């Protein structure tokens, strides 16, 4: 019964949701996350994992702040406002 | 240069009643098990992938080139060639056609 019947005993989580990356990859006992490394100071990622990387890097998200930086620079980090024309 | 090879595919070995072409791992999706890399394989890498360091430009001896364009010029003065080449000059005054420098 190394198979079907021992599968019936599978109801204890090894991994919960990770605070930082969201995946159910937070190892409960080890109190760390196999996908993102949390609570490491750093984010887990290896160079032999180009697909892994590609899946999580910048731009796969919303880029809340960073998206606008390109435009800002185009206009030289303008201080002030536009000025309104005539009639 | 990475097309066709973005898999972790492996041969299943023989004894499994299938050809030994590398196959995609895991389950859950129709890609699982399929043939991977290699030219007979839908998805796989093409035979002898085309490269950039193909020779594109050709060197030609300066003098052959010159010789080349010279005969080419000499030909512009032959009504038979210029007609055969498809130009309509059936009616031009003479050839070579010289025209006032006012042009």
């Amino acid at each position: 019964g190394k198979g079907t019947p021992s599968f019936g005993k599978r109801h204890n989580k090894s991994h919960t949701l990770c605070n930082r990356c969201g995946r159910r990859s937070f190892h409960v006992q080890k109190k760390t996350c196999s996908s993102c490394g949390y609570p490491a100071a750093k984010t887990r990622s290896y160079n032999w994992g180009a697909k892994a990387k590609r899946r999580h890097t910048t731009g796969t998200g919303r880029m809340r702040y960073l998206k606008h930086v390109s435009r800002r620079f185009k206009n030289g980090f303008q201080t002030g406002s536009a000025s309104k024309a005539s009639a | 240069e990475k097309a066709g090879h973005q898999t972790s595919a492996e041969s299943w070995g023989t004894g499994r009643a299938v050809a030994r072409i590398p196959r995609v791992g895991g389950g859950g999706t129709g890609r699982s098990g399929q043939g991977a890399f290699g030219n007979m394989c839908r998805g796989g890498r093409m035979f002898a992938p085309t490269k950039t360091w193909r020779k594109w430009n050709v060197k030609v001896n300066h003098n052959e080139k010159r010789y080349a364009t010279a005969s080419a010029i000499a030909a512009t003065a032959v009504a038979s060639l210029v007609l055969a080449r498809g130009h309509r000059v059936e009616k031009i005054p003479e050839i070579p056609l010289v025209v006032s420098t006012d042009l």
């Binding site: 989580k13 949701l17 159910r24 | -």
Partner: protein, 50 residues
């Protein structure tokens, strides 16, 4: 799971609101090419893995 956590509980609520047929007027939109909800779920065909 009897006494659940709130984090789970929320994740649940989300998941249930997500589970519904396509708002039918969306099919009237110009150039719309969605004829159904291809992300519909069901408690006995696919788990949420927490």
């Amino acid at each position: 799971a009897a006494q659940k956590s709130f984090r789970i509980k929320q994740k649940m609520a989300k998941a249930k609101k997500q589970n519904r047929p396509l708002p039918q007027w969306i099919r009237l939109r110009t150039n719309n090419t969605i004829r159904y909800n291809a992300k519909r779920r069901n408690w006995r065909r696919t788990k949420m893995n927490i």
